[PDB]
Every structure is written in structure tokens, then in C-alpha cells.
């Protein structure tokens, strides 16, 4: 484990929960 591998996994599930919050914002205004 590295200080570079730990900072690439916090940035992948962080552009993630940003897509999940735009994701459930596209499924509720399309109804």
C-alpha cells in the first residue's frame, strides 16, 4: 500500500457519490 494508491481510491468513490447524487436526480425528475 502507498500514499499514491490511497489517494486514487478516495477520488474514485468521490466522482462516484457525485454521479450517484446526479444519478438519483435524473431518475426522479424523469418521472
Amino acid at each position: 500500500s502507498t500514499a499514491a494508491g490511497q489517494e486514487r481510491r478516495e477520488k474514485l468513490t468521490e466522482e462516484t457519490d457525485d454521479l450517484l447524487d446526479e444519478i438519483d436526480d435524473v431518475l426522479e425528475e424523469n418521472a
Binding site: 500500500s1 481510491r9 474514485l12 468513490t13 462516484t16 444519478i23 424523469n30
Partner: protein, 186 residues
Amino acid sequence: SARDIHQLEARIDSLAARNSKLMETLKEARQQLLALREEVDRLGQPPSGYGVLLATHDDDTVDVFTSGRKMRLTCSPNIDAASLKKGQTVRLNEALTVVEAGTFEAVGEISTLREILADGHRALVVGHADEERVVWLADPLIAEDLPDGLPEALNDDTRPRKLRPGDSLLVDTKAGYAFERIPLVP
């Protein structure tokens, strides 16, 4: 002017059903992009350590062997204050804090048993090179509820008992504990 409505009714009714197809086929990429995600969030939380517990001290402190040595560490709430038996395999997180009860690593060196010691918690074993070592014994050798199995002049000792000197029991020299019993068959 009838054509006019038709043309719409027919775009609607044919964008509608493209809508619904894209819906579902876009959901089906969420159940896949979700269960695929959380399997990478588990591959992020650190792995676990195993080791052998020497004894209980009287707080929530315990003596364990682990990576080559003997160290004392804390018990998370979730595990049994003192109802973890003497010298079983246990488990450790990252920062060496205890979390689970286990069994009896039944694999290692085999020794013969010379005598139990003075205070029935320790024993003298000879190993493979004629050499004399001192090991403690882990619970399932001293708990009261254990028979004498009558004599040996009627034979079949395949089942549990009290540790009669002349026995083979299994030990982890480095650690310091014994682990259980073994038939010698001629």
C-alpha cells in the same frame, strides 16, 4: 388535418417506448455498477492478523503471540471480556486490536510429554532432538469434565481424556503453547 394529430400521436407513442427501454436498460447498469463498486470498497479496508493468545490479564488486556513475539493489546467491546479460552487462535485488525475467537491451529511440531508441572498449567516436553522444553497448555487439556478412560489393557483411545505422561501432544515451540492430543498406534 387528421394526418396532423396522427403524426404526433405516433411520435409520442414511439419516443415513449424508447424512453422505457432506456430506463430499464439504464437501471440494469446500476445494479452492476453498484455491486461492482462496493466490492472495491471492501478491497480498500485493510486485511486482518492472526496470532496465539497467551493469557488474560484482568482488565481488557490480553497476552498474544503474533508476528514473532509476545505483545499485549486491547479488546474491542464486541468480544467476550474473559470468556475466550486459554490459548486459542485469535484475530487482529490493522492496529492490532482483537476482534474474534477461533480454534486450535492443529499444525506444527509434535512432542512427547514427560510430566505435567507442579501447578498443572505448564509442562515438560521432549521434542525431536532430545531436548527439554517448557510450554503452557491450552484449555482443552485441563477443564474438569475430562475422564481417565479406564486402563490401556483394553485399548481404543481414539477419544478425549486427561493427559497421561507418555503422550504425544502438539506444540508450537516458538509460541509456548500445547494444542491437543494424538494417538500413537503400533
